[PDB]
Design a protein around this ligand. Structure first.
Ligand SMILES: N[C@@H](Cc1c[nH]c2ccccc12)C(=O)O
Ligand SMILES: N[C@@H](Cc1c[nH]c2ccccc12)C(=O)O
Ligand SMILES: N[C@@H](Cc1c[nH]c2ccccc12)C(=O)O
Ligand SMILES: N[C@@H](Cc1c[nH]c2ccccc12)C(=O)O
Ligand SMILES: N[C@@H](Cc1c[nH]c2ccccc12)C(=O)O
Ligand SMILES: N[C@@H](Cc1c[nH]c2ccccc12)C(=O)O
Ligand SMILES: N[C@@H](Cc1c[nH]c2ccccc12)C(=O)O
Ligand SMILES: N[C@@H](Cc1c[nH]c2ccccc12)C(=O)O
Ligand SMILES: N[C@@H](Cc1c[nH]c2ccccc12)C(=O)O
Ligand SMILES: N[C@@H](Cc1c[nH]c2ccccc12)C(=O)O
Ligand SMILES: N[C@@H](Cc1c[nH]c2ccccc12)C(=O)O
Lengths: 68, 68, 68, 67, 68, 69, 69, 68, 68, 69, 69
């Protein structure tokens, strides 16, 4: 099952899980401060992930960067 | 399952999930502001995804860009 | 399961799902306006897809372009 | 399951599906006009696909052209 | 299942399916006229395929040509 | 889903011979190809080895090999 | 199942496993000192991993480096 | 399931199938004359194959030659 | 199932297996003298492995080196 | 569908020794090869380790290696 | 299932299997003299392998060398 790597490039970046299922709402928001790295799978509970704030992101499709 | 990465290049980009099944309709519209990134799977509920607004998109098939 | 990416290059492009099974007919036609992207799986209900109108298409086999 | 991409290069192209099973006959013919693209899987009901008319075809084994 | 692409380079090409099982005989011949393409799988009923007449053939192991 | 071999006859009377799967090994079928005909043949529940006699151009997943009559 | 490699680049690095399921919280924090390497899988109990502190990290998607506060 | 290609480079090349199971002995020898090719699988009955005589051999690990 | 290779670059390298499950603690420590190699899998009982001491390490993601 | 090793004897009397799978480990068979013969041998229900003694050229999925007598 | 190749570069190399499961102990030590090759799988009974003595080692991650005593 795949995962995504998120490195925060400033304080207060939010990595947000969206619920798997008929319903789509947030469920959890993990706060990363500058320099922290989160490596997060898709799961039974999470089928979409949003990143808000400035971060360096790696997936199986390559690098992408979110901007705050 | 496969997933798509979508980076909003302007405010109010919509990532819309179409229902899996005999019937096809929108079940969910996720609004991304400029610079946000959504990493979204195909799932039991979502078998097609439509992007409206300017965004940079990655899929297993490479890059493509939606335009406003 | 495989998917196809379709970017509409003009207004009114139609992405048409054909039914899986003994019977073959159109069960849905999704209209895309210019610059919209649709990423669409093969599914239990859809075993062939037809694109009509000017579009840029990616699949596992590479890029192809439909014309209006 | 694998699929074929067909792009019609002229009007009137036929993409014809052949029945899986002990017997072989055509169960559907989809007409493509010039510039339309069909992406079609092999399925429970279709184990062979015939293309008639001028089209650009892609499969996992690369490009081929019908005339 | 694997499949073979056969493009007929002259009229009257025959693509012949041989029965799966302890018995081997031809169960079907699909006749192709010049420039027709047939994309044919191996199946519960067809464990060998013979081509007669001039054709350009593609398989997973590359290109081969048959000559009449 | 099994592997397959492509055989192109380079002369008349080429034989593609199927050997039986199981405790018993014997020839169960011999397919005659004449010059320029092609046979694409799988390994199967009944065929666990394939013998080619005569001049033929053969492709497997391991590459090209040629049999000589 | 996938795993991540983490090499601590200073003392006191924490590799934090987050619980799998509807609930998200830290269930374990593994402390690494300078020079030590942890190779950790995703598991039934850990579906996200956070790294705090300076570390050199490899995953299937390539190298990334965490930086400490 | 894997297979070995054997091309006889002289008469009387012997391709020898060894029994799968707790016991090991040969259960079949298939002789090849010069220029014949044998493509043989590993099977429920054959878990090791010995080639005697001069032969050109392909396996998934490359080419090897037996000397007779 | 994945494995790591550990080559000890000095005496007393410590390869530490952490218990798989809701609880985390070490369940085994295998010490290596200089020049010894351990090739160890992830298993039902081990889901994280820590290396202490100077070692040359190979995994599917490349080479890494622990320092004592 | 297991892996297999290719052993080509470079001298007479090479031994390809199968070791028993399971809790116990012992030689269950030594196949003797003479110079120039090739054995292609799988891992199986009964054989989980293979020892080669004598001079031989060996191929496995990780490359070529040579045993010496 | 994966395997490792070990070629002894001196006499008396040991290839040691560690038990799979909750208990970890050596259950077998295979002695190789110089020039002999052992190709050994991970198994229901062995989930880690230690090599002691000078040996040339191939795994799916490439070449490694153990250095003797
Ligand atoms: N308990 C959460 C942990 C998690 C994994 N991926 C995430 C991405 C975003 C937020 C939380 C998560 C889950 O299993 O789904
Ligand atoms: N709850 C939705 C979440 C989702 C995943 N991918 C999406 C794409 C678009 C909109 C919503 C989604 C689902 O499980 O299907
Ligand atoms: N409800 C449709 C959605 C869909 C997927 N791919 C498509 C292609 C064309 C039209 C509709 C679709 C289905 O699950 O099949
Ligand atoms: N109902 C048909 C649709 C179809 C798929 N691929 C085709 C190729 C040709 C004709 C029809 C089709 C099926 O599932 O088999
Ligand atoms: N009804 C046949 C159709 C077919 C598939 N592949 C073929 C190759 C040759 C001739 C016929 C076929 C079958 O399912 O087997
Ligand atoms: N009836 C035979 C047909 C066959 C497949 N591959 C072959 C190779 C050689 C001879 C016959 C065959 C079978 O299913 O096994
Ligand atoms: N007992 C934990 C061990 C572990 C694996 N990966 C981790 C990452 C971080 C923290 C602990 C872990 C588990 O099986 O999940
Ligand atoms: N009946 C034998 C045929 C065979 C396959 N591969 C071989 C290699 C050598 C000798 C015989 C064979 C089997 O199924 O096992
Ligand atoms: N009867 C043995 C044959 C065998 C396979 N590979 C071997 C390696 C060495 C010795 C014998 C063998 C087995 O099935 O296991
Ligand atoms: N009987 C042992 C044989 C073995 C396989 N690989 C090993 C590695 C080291 C020592 C013994 C072995 C087992 O099946 O596990
Ligand atoms: N009995 C342990 C052996 C082991 C495998 N990999 C390890 C890594 C570290 C320590 C012990 C091990 C197990 O099967 O899990």
């Amino acid at each position: 099952s795949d995962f995504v790597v998120i490195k925060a490039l400033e304080d207060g970046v939010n990595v947000i899980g969206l619920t798997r299922g008929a319903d789509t709402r947030f469920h959890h928001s993990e706060k990363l401060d500058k320099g922290e790295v989160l490596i997060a799978q898709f799961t039974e509970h999470t089928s979409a992930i949003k990143v808000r704030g400035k971060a360096y992101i790696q997936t199986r499709h390559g690098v992408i960067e979110s901007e705050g």
